[PDB]
Design a protein around this ligand. Sequence first.
Ligand SMILES: [Zn+2]
Ligand SMILES: [Zn+2]
Lengths: 141, 140
Amino acid sequence: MEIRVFRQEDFEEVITLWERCDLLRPWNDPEMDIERKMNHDVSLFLVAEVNGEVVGTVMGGYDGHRGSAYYLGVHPEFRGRGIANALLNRLEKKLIARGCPKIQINVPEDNDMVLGMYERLGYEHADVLSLGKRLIEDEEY
Amino acid sequence: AMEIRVFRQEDFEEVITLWERCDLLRPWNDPEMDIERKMNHDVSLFLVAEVNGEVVGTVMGGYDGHRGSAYYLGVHPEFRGRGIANALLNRLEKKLIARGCPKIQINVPEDNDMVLGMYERLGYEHADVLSLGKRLIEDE
Ligand SMILES: [Zn+2]
Ligand SMILES: [Zn+2]
């Protein structure tokens, strides 16, 4: 396999991958989320392709101060082969390449597993509360 | 005469000074480098608040194509009776909306109830989530 940048043709294949990995939350329209990312900057939005097919994603980003990562998933049939790791290790390097000093990720608290994965890779938990506010509402889909 | 506008190169050392006075600097974040990171990337969400020509508040707003962000929110100790932080976040929020950003997320210290309360009062809600981070470039 091989990690590259998301391109428009990857659009339905990615949604259908997010489907299979249950990354889909009713609040967030994934069509909209991809459109936003496209309008914005696709360059830290990476896909893993095996056999000329997408099997993993990470929507990474950078705001001029912190790196981010959302929509990190790997196809349940492709889960043994270090894909999410290759995917995070490519993002972190693409971030360093543009002077991003730190990346920060939110993980569901009850998910003790994915929590251990990140810690393994040298991520520290911060003693902060994440606070959020909805600015634009996504319809149901 | 208070006015919120976008950060300008001229504001550079005034803002650093304000960050000092606002007890916002940390030895692991070089504020010159952070200002420079931001300028090189996109300065349009990096807001200041000026009162009679003086910069007395900032917010380094941000957007990543999915989520909006805010760092370095400070208002000069002497300019705190006046809704300036509120004005800073309100404008940032409008600016995020203007470019299609659906949501802003801000991390606040688990101790700092005064700040948690401000955000709640502004309509921010707690997410049942844990913040993990990884330093990629050390400032030194
Ligand atoms: Zn396609
Ligand atoms: Zn810790």
